[PDB]
Design an enzyme around this catalytic site. Structure first.
Site, PDB file in Angstrom:
ATOM      1  N   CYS B 105       0.833  -1.202   0.000  1.00  0.00           N
ATOM      2  CA  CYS B 105       0.000   0.000   0.000  1.00  0.00           C
ATOM      3  C   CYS B 105       0.871   1.256   0.000  1.00  0.00           C
ATOM      4  O   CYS B 105       1.448   1.558  -1.036  1.00  0.00           O
ATOM      5  CB  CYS B 105      -1.011  -0.022   1.156  1.00  0.00           C
ATOM      6  SG  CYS B 105      -2.388   1.128   0.785  1.00  0.00           S
ATOM      7  N   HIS B 125      -0.196   1.503  -3.531  1.00  0.00           N
ATOM      8  CA  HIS B 125      -1.542   2.062  -3.705  1.00  0.00           C
ATOM      9  C   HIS B 125      -1.496   3.105  -4.824  1.00  0.00           C
ATOM     10  O   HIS B 125      -0.476   3.764  -4.997  1.00  0.00           O
ATOM     11  CB  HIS B 125      -2.063   2.730  -2.421  1.00  0.00           C
ATOM     12  CG  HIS B 125      -3.553   3.013  -2.445  1.00  0.00           C
ATOM     13  ND1 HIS B 125      -4.088   4.147  -3.007  1.00  0.00           N
ATOM     14  CD2 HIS B 125      -4.619   2.258  -2.056  1.00  0.00           C
ATOM     15  CE1 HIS B 125      -5.410   4.082  -2.963  1.00  0.00           C
ATOM     16  NE2 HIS B 125      -5.767   2.957  -2.367  1.00  0.00           N
TER      17      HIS B 125
END
Lengths: 188, 188
Positions: B105, B125
């Site tokens: 992420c 992400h």
């Protein structure tokens, strides 16, 4: 104007099935209380993750009512839920006021223990099916998420995201659920 | 004969991205240490879940080496990782011994901060892409899980299961990963 969620956290709960709904529900702007079955003290989950609850269940009981009561899974966690008289009283009250009750994996077996929602369609982890179906008091479904009336159930750790988004959708509606879902990078 | 994993837990980490790998890795029989960046004290994650670490990073540093070092995401958690000199030393040592480094992420941005793995294919992400790509030191991928050499990255909370199973597969092999996966009730 804020919806409220109670998550009941007992020793041996499945930590993924606890953290995923809490996190997602808070992303949706729901006020979540993680309440420790045994008190305010840290709870050792099934895979040894240790989580500090927000409050004891006794304190959280006095700050109701909740729009959803959430029972995580984990075999030993569900058994602790199933044996607790405080859980029984909390669930029986939620059922009477027609509030939502959500349980995942082995969690639904506490409903049977406490005689909650007989006649409803429910799902469980496959390994908990036989236990949930003792007596034929429910109808079994193999859907990943199942909702019948005010009873929302789901199957395992891998359904945790779909279970949590179904709670969001029930409480806050489909548009909020879709908004919360996009930044998560879910497949479907 | 036991593989070992270090998960570095800083304030503001994404709690789902922390608990899912820890739990899955422990299901695979890996010995996981959840190490608190700032000490042994409880860590407030991004969505206010509070987790008790197994040890301080300082203590965990002395009990190496680890077969995998795991960096969760969460914007503020990654920033704390990116600023920590202890993290830098841990990562630089893992890279030199050709051990695995896994980040999800926003977590991968700590690699850039610490000059780790330049030249590798990585994902983040989508909201962290621009930050990771400052300088063009990596090549970007949009695969949900990306592995290039000893660098394993993944995109967000919803890829957490696939990220964790890829760690299992790297450490313990494909058959263990498939065995751990079946009881989770994942879709694919």
């Amino acid at each position: 104007a804020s919806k409220r969620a109670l998550v009941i956290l007992a020793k041996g709960a499945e930590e993924m099935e606890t953290v995923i709904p809490v996190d997602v529900m808070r992303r949706a702007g729901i006020k979540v209380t993680v309440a420790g079955l045994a008190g305010k003290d840290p709870v050792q989950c099934s895979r040894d993750v240790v989580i500090c609850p927000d409050a004891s269940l006794e304190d959280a009981k006095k700050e109701g009512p909740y729009d959803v009561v959430v029972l995580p899974g984990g075999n030993l966690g569900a058994q602790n839920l199933s044996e607790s008289a405080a859980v029984k009283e909390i669930l029986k009250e939620q059922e009477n006021r027609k509030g939502l009750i959500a349980a995942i994996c082995a969690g639904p077996t506490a409903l049977l223990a406490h005689e909650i929602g007989f006649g409803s369609k429910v799902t469980t982890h496959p390994l908990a099916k036989d236990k949930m179906m003792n007596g034929g008091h429910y109808t079994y479904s193999e859907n990943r998420v199942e909702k019948d009336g005010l009873i929302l159930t789901s199957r395992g750790p891998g359904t945790s995201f779909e279970f949590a988004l179904a709670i969001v959708e029930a409480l806050n509606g489909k548009e909020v659920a879709a908004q919360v879902k996009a930044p998560l990078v879910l497949k479907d």
